[PDB]
């Protein structure tokens, strides 16, 4: 299947992902094409933050699903 990972900056990352793939697997791929370590990535889907150890299927992330890659900001 195919999913989308849109960043807070507007950049859209498309990914061919297995329903068996772990969140860890996905975090590793996003590092390999944006340059931020997994522990600094914050992925969100359907109102819950994806945690390690689980899979896309555990969150029912089917095709054409869109994840949001966000971060915290320091300004005030």
């Amino acid at each position: 299947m195919q999913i989308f990972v849109r960043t807070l900056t507007g950049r859209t990352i498309t990914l061919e992902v297995e329903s068996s793939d772990t969140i860890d697997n996905v975090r590793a791929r996003i590092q390999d094409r944006e340059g931020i370590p997994p522990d600094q990535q914050r992925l969100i889907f359907a109102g819950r933050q994806l945690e390690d150890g689980r899979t896309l299927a555990d969150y029912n992330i089917q095709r054409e699903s869109t994840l949001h890659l966000v971060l915290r900001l320091r300004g005030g």
Binding site: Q31, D32, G35, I36, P37, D39, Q40
Partner: protein
Amino acid sequence: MPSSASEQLLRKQLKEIQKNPPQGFSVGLVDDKSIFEWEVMIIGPEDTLYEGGFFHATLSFPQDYPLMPPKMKFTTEIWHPNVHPNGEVCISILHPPGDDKYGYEDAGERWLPVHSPETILISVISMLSSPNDESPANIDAAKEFRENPQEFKKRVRRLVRRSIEMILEHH
């Protein structure tokens, strides 16, 4: 006030390195006052230009470690292309993150939050064995190593001797 993630990680890493210490260097704290200031004594690697030598350095860890790498400074006088005259070590693994700008050096070759202090020190050992001429910190040393490596060889060996005479300082 509890401890940050930085403090916890340094403890576990200090414990592990000071459990099964990899040969070639010794690791301890400059003072128990702070686990963010390690001192490191390195044996000059075998067969290399520096063999027999005894080099003391300081790993200074940043407050936001491991987001940022530690800074390693040789206190012992040393003559190396990748080592600034002030003592600071300049190698890829200790370069801050990450990609950019034109697309020459990737993010995966510099600092990563996963690299243990042991991984760093091992990288600095190999640095002593085979200088990297793509990142010279000491211009004068970088030339002598290239245009007359037999006078460079001479100067290193002189500094190797002066390091031993400083061990005698413990008197």
